[PDB]
Ligand binder design. Structure first.
Ligand SMILES: [Ca+2]
Ligand SMILES: [Ca+2]
Ligand SMILES: [Ca+2]
Ligand SMILES: [Ca+2]
Lengths: 662, 662
């Protein structure tokens, strides 16, 4: 239940074929790891692996790296005040949290020789036998965290701060976003329950309220996010960039900002592959569109038209079949997007991650909302263009076995099906399936001087677990917010159902980092990043889509000017409430920015405190008339008219007398 | 043609009734002015006035104030580097420009005793006899500037920098905005000429092009504006606030940011009068609306219907009468807005100016565009609601003297009339009328030891001139941009005509500061301020209004869905080109921000430069096992397994041998 002081573990898989080359790479690697000053020790692993364990040897060397990294943060404006010296007073002023500690150790093992560490990064360099580097878990803290999170009804800020301290700013920002999104989701849950009973099906007022809620949630999250970035000391990390190791470059250009000159990739090749990404997206659009029109037409055919052979559940099967088939096609599309993003060089890790989020968001947008879009904007207004598909299915079924009545309430059943079906299969695939797969591997598996067998056992089991990426849970929550933003007017209870899911999701991902995945390398982030852009786009499209859906599915016939007027009125109401909420949150005066600028002014004011009259006037005028006497003349005689101030007083008084006389 | 070294002039009008009280105020004032260290001298003026002239006595005291003010700028992040000391090396590094010199002198005469100067501000304090404080002109530089600006075809950057150096950042920002607006107005001038001959009347493509041009001009001006704010060293002055002297307060609260505590006004009274401002605006709306429907209905009646008694020019007179009557009603409305803004306390001068710009922009918006709005959106689509006004005018004219045929080409004549009529009456009222009024006063008017009569003559004539406010010329140019943004599709040549006007306006205001007004007190500004907000709002409304006008006045009948679709398509095209232009200007990498962050990093890197391995690992592990030997035990024995790195090397090699054997 306790680690042995291991800061980091390196796997170093050794293949049997490339044996002695891996031996040479291993000894060169451990020479690099003793060069950087980390105490290292080698242990056996499964499948010809040498799990090496690295910790800080000298706490003075570790505090030296701490001071250097804090200085590098302060040079780029991240830290408000400079660390003074390694007199141990720096650690006494601001203590090193475990997230910062493991981040600086990973920077010592990862950064190249110019920065101050060894480069062991496997993909670019000769260290191909290095499989992965990871920090261990603390099972006592893990059990205490999962018990305290399952016991609590809501989560305090100190739980998010503990998640920060032990897991990094990215995981902390995710759990803070989930907490704030749950506590803001409690509002349209209640109003959707109060608009499903009291108000009619497809109410306009719920659409306008959902637009208002989406705006105020997005802007309040942005304000809370910059407040948290002030509080954790991580504000401004988006400006400093981290170079990517997998970057390949042609030549090297001059230093733009700093002193050292950087490498460059000619961007025309990047624009070439970035225009290559577009036919892939169009092919995904037409493939998913053909699949969804095939499945939806077959579902409509066997449900409404073909009520002969085959029962009702035979009719209900293929849409459920599509929903279960959706993870695999989503997985191969995400793998294709990842390979295409790895195909293009991005010099910074931030631009690489942003392009990856953009591709994954486009793909998950299509595979999440294409069915509801083809239901709302195709099947309801003009389902006569899909009517020859019904004749095609009739003609195939007539040879196989030897009037449409389109209803506007099918979108409600489809939205309810997507909601409960997606959350059930998501909870199944998220936590249940990997846990029972780990139990199956434990049953499949069922020296070291008998002190560490229980420890090296859990280390070898932690080796096999995949690394936890927070982008997936961000993508799940952003897709859920898109559901609430643009399709909750179909099923007004769905937000309420999402509310319940969010509560267990706030524990479920808290379990998934706990026992189902290894500890992620703790990175620092300013914000959630591109998910702000995706969230704002989902809100803006949510207003238009909600009002277009409420007008069309409201249902002498539908007139075009009603649809256009409702869309324009909702979009302008969205812009108006956006300006109003931005104005109020501009006036609300969050405390962290205030305390930041106050402490900065106190620092510069300490630097400030680090740093008769008519006698002086008559003295400098005396030097002026002395310079006149040394040698133009009218201005000097003009200023020598009235040198003394009392002379000006009495001359002004007699001037007032002269103006009195005239 | 040369000043006598006078930094500033104070008028100090003395009324005959309040004589000795003004004498006591005068002597107390000159005691304050010799307390601050300024050499002062009193001269006669007209109408019982004592024009006092103040200059720097000690250049060391002046450089002391220079260093203190530069330090106060650097403490709030305005200056990138601190001024080191008054060793005269500060002036040798960065010289004091004349704008900064006169600004610091005006701060010495204006700021209260806590700041470091005397308070002589007339409105709040007992210094009611003080009329106005102003700096003098330099007639040689003024003549050289007006000759070089009339001779040039375009203006270089160095002319704007000379205007900066001698006149302050506000006047510099205005002339830079006018230059950039002229050089961007040359584009839709040419495209409007090429859309008036080639394309038809009311073309859609010109409306979309005008929207695109308005977006790219606004965003390019914002980028050029932050570049100029970097270059002049005035970036960030919008953050530091200047307290208003006319502020009246109830009590004093704590310090939010700084060390010294500030005074406060209870904001509920401010919200009370800010809700009072709204019935005034509604009354202005209904008054201007009744006036414009009366004038427009009478014009339509005497032109189209009443073609009997009275000629055609009798018919054309009342619209011209309204255009000439528009300055007086605009003047009384601006005076009412100024009195209402003076009624409300604003603690900072910036918030006071912003509220004043907001009120003046609303009023000038109504009195500028109400006629064109009632032409486009009332007279064209349904002019039958104004048809009983025609019967009312017929019934009055039938008793006075003892079928409508609405044409869509009246808006073109009205736009041409507004363009050429407004620019002609604007050039008349701007430069011609005050110059001939000054000539009339010179003919009406037609001691000091006969050295300064020509100088004190020009000083007494400069006393009578009104102070130059840049808000008026900002308002004129923003109204012109609004004309181009939302009504240029009516008359596509108008932008071209505006282009010609802008050229002479770039000299005309350059004459108006020259001979028709006194020198303004040089203030520093970060940006043009609220005119950015008014400009962006005018652009956004310009897209909608241009497309609605092109659809309605295009002209079986007008269908509502066509109007709504055209409005929605143009507004979405506006948002799309807004995102695209913001993306390109985010990628364009302006040089000034780069050089700023580079020089800041070089400063902090100079502060940075102000500030074996396995032996250390084995030494700290030796201390660790010594701490073990002094006295838990499994981790210590684990790390004492393989202390030496070469031991780990050979143990790893035999581990590879063991994995080879199994
Ligand atoms: Ca789940
Ligand atoms: Ca998740
Ligand atoms: Ca003019
Ligand atoms: Ca002007």
């Amino acid at each position: 239940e306790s680690n042995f002081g291991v800061d980091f573990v390196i796997h170093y898989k050794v293949p049997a074929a490339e044996r002695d080359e891996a031996e040479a790479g291993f000894v060169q690697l451990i020479r690099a790891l003793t060069t950087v000053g980390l105490a290292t020790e080698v242990r056996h692993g499964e499948n010809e692996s040498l799990l090496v364990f690295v910790k800080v040897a000298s706490p003075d060397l570790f505090a030296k790296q701490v001071y250097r990294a804090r200085l590098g943060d302060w040079l780029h404006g991240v830290r408000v005040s400079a660390p003074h010296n390694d007199i141990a007073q720096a650690l006494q002023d601001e203590p090193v949290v475990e997230a910062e500690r493991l981040r600086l150790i990973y920077l010592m093992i990862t950064k190249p020789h110019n920065e101050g560490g060894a480069g062991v990064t496997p993909t670019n360099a000769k260290w191909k036998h290095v499989e992965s580097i990871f920090p261990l878990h603390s099972h006592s803290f893990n059990k205490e965290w999962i018990k305290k999170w399952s016991s609590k009804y809501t989560l305090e800020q100190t739980d998010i701060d503990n998640i920060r301290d032990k897991f990094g700013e990215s995981v902390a920002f995710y759990f803070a976003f989930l907490r704030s999104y749950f506590r803001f989701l409690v509002i349209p849950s209640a109003f959707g329950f109060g608009a499903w009973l009291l108000l009619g099906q497809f109410s306009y007022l719920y659409a306008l309220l959902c637009g208002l809620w989406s705006v105020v949630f997005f802007e309040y999250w942005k304000k809370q996010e910059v407040d948290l970035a002030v509080q954790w000391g991580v504000r401004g990390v988006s400006s400093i960039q981290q170079s990517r190791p997998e970057f390949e470059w042609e030549h090297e250009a001059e230093d733009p900002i700093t002193g050292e000159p950087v490498k460059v990739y000619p961007p025309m090749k990047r624009v070439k592959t970035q225009l290559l990404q577009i036919p892939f997206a169009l092919a995904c659009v037409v493939a998913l569109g053909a699949l969804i029109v095939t499945c939806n037409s077959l579902e409509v055919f066997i449900n409404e038209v073909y009520s002969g052979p085959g029962k009702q559940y035979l009719g209900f099967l293929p849409t459920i079949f599509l929903v279960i088939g959706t993870p695999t096609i989503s997985g191969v599309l995400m793998g294709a997007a990842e390979k295409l993003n790895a195909m293009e060089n991005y010099a910074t890790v931030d631009a690489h991650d942003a392009a990856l989020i953009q591709k994954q968001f486009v793909l998950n947008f299509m595979t999440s909302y294409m069915a509801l879009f083809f239901t709302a904007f195709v099947y309801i207004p003009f389902g006569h263009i899909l009517h020859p598909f019904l004749n095609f299915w009739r003609a195939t079924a007539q040879t196989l076995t030897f009037e449409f009545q389109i209803n506007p309430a099918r979108i409600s059943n489809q939205m309810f099906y997507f909601t409960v079906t997606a959350q059930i299969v998501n909870f199944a695939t998220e936590v249940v399936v990997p846990y029972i797969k780990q139990q199956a591997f434990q049953k499949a598996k069922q020296e070291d001087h008998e002190e560490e067998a229980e420890f090296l056992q859990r280390v070898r089991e932690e080796c096999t677990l995949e690394e936890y990426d927070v982008s997936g849970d961000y993508r799940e929550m952003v897709m859920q917010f898109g559901y609430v933003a643009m399709f909750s007017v179909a099923w007004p209870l769905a937000a309420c159902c999402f509310l319940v899911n969010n509560w267990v999701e706030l524990r479920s991902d808290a379990l998934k980092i706990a026992i189902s995945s290894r500890r992620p390398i703790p990175w620092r982030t300013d914000s959630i990043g591109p998910w702000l852009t995706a969230l704002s786009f989902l809100s803006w499209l949510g207003s238009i889509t909600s009002s277009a859906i409420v007008y069309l599915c409201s249902n002498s016939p539908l007139k075009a000017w009603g649809l256009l007027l409702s869309i324009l009125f909702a979009e302008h109401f969205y812009l108006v409430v956006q300006l109003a909420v931005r104005f109020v949150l501009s006036k609300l005066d969050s405390p962290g920015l205030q305390k930041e600028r106050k402490e900065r002014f106190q620092t510069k004011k300490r630097l400030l405190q680090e740093n008769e009259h008519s006698e002086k006037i008559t003295r400098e005028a005396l030097e002026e008339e002395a310079r006149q006497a040394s040698i133009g003349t009218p201005e000097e005689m003009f200023w020598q008219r009235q040198r003394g101030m009392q002379e000006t007083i009495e001359i002004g008084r007699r001037m007032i007398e002269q103006q009195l006389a005239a």
